[PDB]
């Protein structure tokens, strides 16, 4: 089963809006069962329209917001499933401006 190894932005980061969010896992993801939802939890919870896709490599998931992210706090809830079928879930939070 996969573990999250790294993400851009990192947990607890504050800065400019990212063009995309990348999640990197320890095992190859099964794409049809793995996913993510982006939520805005605070403004200076609302779902944010975003496309989710496999990265360059099978261990990466990329989230691309449909519009530039506005200033506030965000949470990425993710679900990662590999060939052993056990779903692993977690959350990454970061702030924009
Ligand atoms: Na997927």
């Amino acid at each position: 089963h996969p573990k999250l190894v790294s993400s851009t932005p990192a947990e607890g980061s504050e800065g400019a809006a990212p063009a995309k969010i990348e999640l990197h896992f320890s095992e190859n993801l099964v794409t049809q069962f793995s996913g993510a939802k982006l939520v805005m939890t605070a403004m200076p919870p609302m779902a944010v329209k975003a496309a989710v896709s496999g990265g360059g490599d099978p261990k990466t998931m990329v989230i691309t917001p449909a519009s530039p992210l506005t200033a506030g706090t965000y949470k990425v809830d993710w679900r990662a499933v590999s060939s052993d079928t056990f779903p692993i879930t977690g959350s990454v939070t970061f702030k924009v401006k």
Side-chain angles (χ1 to χ4, degrees):
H1 62 274
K3 349 301 172 315
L4 188 75
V5 171
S6 177
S7 72
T8 167
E11 171 67 44
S13 186
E14 317 182 5
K20 56 187 183 142
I21 301 137
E22 303 177 33
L23 302 176
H24 304 275
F25 300 89
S26 53
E27 292 192 347
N28 296 345
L29 297 190
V30 176
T31 317
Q32 68 173 331
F33 305 124
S34 300
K37 203 175 201 193
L38 180 66
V39 189
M40 187 179 203
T41 58
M43 311 182 67
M46 299 190 73
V48 177
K49 192 158 282 183
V52 181
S53 49
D57 81 283
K59 302 189 174 192
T60 300
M61 219 171 60
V62 183
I63 302 97
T64 309
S67 48
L69 291 185
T70 65
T73 302
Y74 292 85
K75 187 169 87 107
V76 181
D77 288 337
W78 55 262
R79 183 170 178 96
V81 176
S82 73
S83 54
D84 64 21
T85 77
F86 289 96
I88 304 303
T89 53
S91 203
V92 174
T93 59
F94 64 90
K95 298 159 76 169
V96 175
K97 265 57 166 224

